[PDB]
Amino acid sequence: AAEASKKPRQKRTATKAYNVTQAFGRRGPEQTQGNFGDQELIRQGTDYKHWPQIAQFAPSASAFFGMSRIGMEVTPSGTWLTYTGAIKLDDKDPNFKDQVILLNKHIDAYKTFP
Amino acid sequence: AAEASKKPRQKRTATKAYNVTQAFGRRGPEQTQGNFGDQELIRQGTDYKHWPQIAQFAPSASAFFGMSRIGMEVTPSGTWLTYTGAIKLDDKDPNFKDQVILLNKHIDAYKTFP
């Protein structure tokens, strides 16, 4: 969508009409390039039927800035806010095994298709 | 606030009633610690007067999983969804210089705490 693309990258919401590749670029291995999503998620974004079970791990704005290591880098391409962190899965959730399966299905999935 | 602390860490929202330290731990230099926030933001969370100007850089759930390098690390301490990335600021934005000042006021601010 033309209107979906107008938002800053970090505020975009991928959907079937404006998919993960369109919003966030092709998946790949490079440092600041996204590696998450199998072909179905890539094509569907938040319309993906199991998106809620993925989104339960995304941080709120408060937690993004509260949990992460934040930095600022000024480079020839511009000024970038860098972030790193980790979110613990709840080993006592009965759904833990399915959550690991679902996340692993999408991490680096792009390696198996063009 | 009782409901606030019950949420998984990544879904917590810091406020003046449940602050950044309570929700996300003390700021510090270790890889597992957050480093972001001066004393005012830490105390106020999302009630901080300039919170919207910071939150504009936090990612949507779709962008979190679309832009980031995502990994799964199984360690003795548990199973962790790791994330790393970078968000470009818009140089042409008229508030750019204010955004740089604000971020610089919070990144590693804890180093100067008494």
Curated annotation (Swiss-Prot), chains A, B:
Keyword annotations from UniProtKB, A to Z: Acetylation, ADP-ribosylation, Host cytoplasm, Phosphoprotein, Ribonucleoprotein, RNA-binding, Secreted, Transcription, Transcription regulation, Viral nucleoprotein, Virion
Molecular function terms, GO-annotated: identical protein binding; MHC class I protein binding; molecular condensate scaffold activity; poly(U) RNA binding; protein homodimerization activity; protein sequestering activity; RNA binding; RNA stem-loop binding
Main location: virion
Post-translational modification: ADP-ribosylated. The ADP-ribosylation is retained in the virion during infection. Phosphorylated on serine residues by host GSK3A and GSK3B. This promotes the solubility of homodimers that would otherwise aggregate. Host phosphatase would dephosphorylate the protein during assembly at M bound membranes.
Boundaries of every CoV N CTD domain copy: 1-114
Taxonomy, superkingdom: Viruses
Region feature (Dimerization): 8-111
One biological process term in Gene Ontology: response to host immune response
Chain positions covered by the region annotation Putative NLRP3 binding: 10-90
Compartment(s) of residence: Virion; Host cytoplasm; Secreted; Host extracellular space
Motif (Nuclear localization signal): 6-14
Family statement drawn from the similarity comment of this UniProt entry: Belongs to the betacoronavirus nucleocapsid protein family.
UniProt function note: Packages the positive strand viral genome RNA into a helical ribonucleocapsid (RNP) and plays a fundamental role during virion assembly through its interactions with the viral genome and membrane protein M. Plays an important role in enhancing the efficiency of subgenomic viral RNA transcription as well as viral replication. Attenuates the stress granules formation by reducing host G3BP1 access to host mRNAs under stress conditions.
Protein name: Nucleoprotein
Source organism per UniProt: Severe acute respiratory syndrome coronavirus 2 (2019-nCoV)
First and last residues shown, out of full length: 251 to 364 of 419
